[PDB]
């Protein structure tokens, strides 16, 4: 009767996008503009922009109407 977390399983119909925390370690962030100190202070990081861009690049790539 307790709660066990289960990740949101939504089909993207495309290649798997690397996790947000791994973008810097995998080298993606070297190809997106660095976030300004004001951006970081507000909580906005370049990882978010990179993750969104990759997710939209890979979304529905394997989908046939």
């Amino acid at each position: 009767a307790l709660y066990e977390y289960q990740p949101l399983q939504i089909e993207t119909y495309g290649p798997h996008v690397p996790e947000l925390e791994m973008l810097g370690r995998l080298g993606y962030l070297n190809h997106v503009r660095a976030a300004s100190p004001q951006d970081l202070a507000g909580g906005y990081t370049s990882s978010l922009a990179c993750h969104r861009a990759l997710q939209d690049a890979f979304s529905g790539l394997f989908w046939q109407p």
């Binding site: 190809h31 861009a53 690049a57 890979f58 979304s59």
Partner: protein
């Protein structure tokens, strides 16, 4: 996200034949209503398509010279609105000149490009009285356009997937030394893609990837390994074959697209003015 969007669920169609069926049905419904109200006046669906292509080009011209500078995503949303509206409506019932302006208006609103109505209508190359008249027409047609879109306002453009593919290529495809030299030509190809029915038949990611690989082929650079290795298509060869077929059919779509001709455009415009005056 596109993968569970209304664009994929309701506005990406199986074939060009289905789009032709929808357009022909719209034309036939208008003909039935005009005859049941009480002749060479009516336009045929191919003439409707020619007029729609011409007025999409005018919509692009309007959005290009729009001050303040229209974001490219707003222009994409407006063009998608125009295509979707004239998938199920005829240029004889609703004039494309007003519908394109209404599409741009609704796109500016939906894409959070805050522009006041007076400064929206100030971009029209017309005297002020025409600008107020056009504003009233746009306000009248805004709800009609929204209803005809089935209240599906979020449009997924290929531009952000294009940026994501460029990031992925820069990170994981060192064979492509500088992916940025692909952008310009790819952008060009994207524009041509926008003139066809591809936005109604293919996912934005597929469109962006096809544009990128067409640019690469035009540059002489071959990137089969990016699909097979980087994109994980060597484990599933069938999916890779389907992707290749999608891209080839998209290139054929761009190849067989026909821009409207000026004389045919003028004749059809005069015919459409006749239709709207008689109606």
């Amino acid at each position: 996200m596109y993968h569970n969007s209304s664009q994929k669920r309701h506005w990406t169609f199986s074939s060009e034949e289905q789009l032709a069926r929808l357009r022909a049905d719209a034309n036939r419904k208008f003909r039935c209503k005009a005859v049941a109200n009480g002749d060479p006046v009516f336009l045929e669906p191919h003439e409707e398509m020619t007029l729609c292509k011409y007025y999409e080009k005018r919509l692009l011209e309007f959005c290009s010279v729009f001050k303040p500078a229209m974001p490219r995503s707003v222009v994409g949303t407006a063009c998608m609105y125009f295509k979707r509206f004239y998938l199920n409506n005829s240029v004889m019932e609703y004039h494309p000149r007003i519908i394109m302006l209404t599409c741009a208006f609704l796109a500016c609103k939906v894409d959070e490009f805050n522009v006041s109505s007076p400064q929206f209508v100030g971009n029209l190359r017309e005297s002020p009285l025409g600008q107020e008249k056009a504003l009233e027409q746009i306000l009248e047609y805004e709800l009609l356009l929204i209803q005809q879109l089935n209240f599906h306002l979020i449009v997924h453009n290929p531009y952000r997937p294009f940026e994501g593919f460029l990031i992925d290529l820069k990170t994981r495809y060192p064979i492509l030394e500088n992916p940025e030299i692909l952008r310009k030509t790819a952008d060009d190809f994207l524009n041509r893609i926008a003139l066809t029915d591809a936005y109604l038949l293919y996912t934005p990611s597929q469109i962006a990837l096809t544009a990128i690989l067409s640019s690469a082929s035009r540059a002489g650079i071959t990137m089969e390994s990016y699909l097979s290795e980087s994109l994980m298509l060597k484990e599933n060869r069938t999916c890779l074959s389907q992707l290749l077929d999608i891209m080839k059919s998209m290139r054929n779509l761009v190849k067989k697209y026909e821009p409207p001709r000026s004389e045919e455009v003028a004749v059809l415009k005069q015919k459409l003015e006749r239709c709207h005056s008689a109606e």
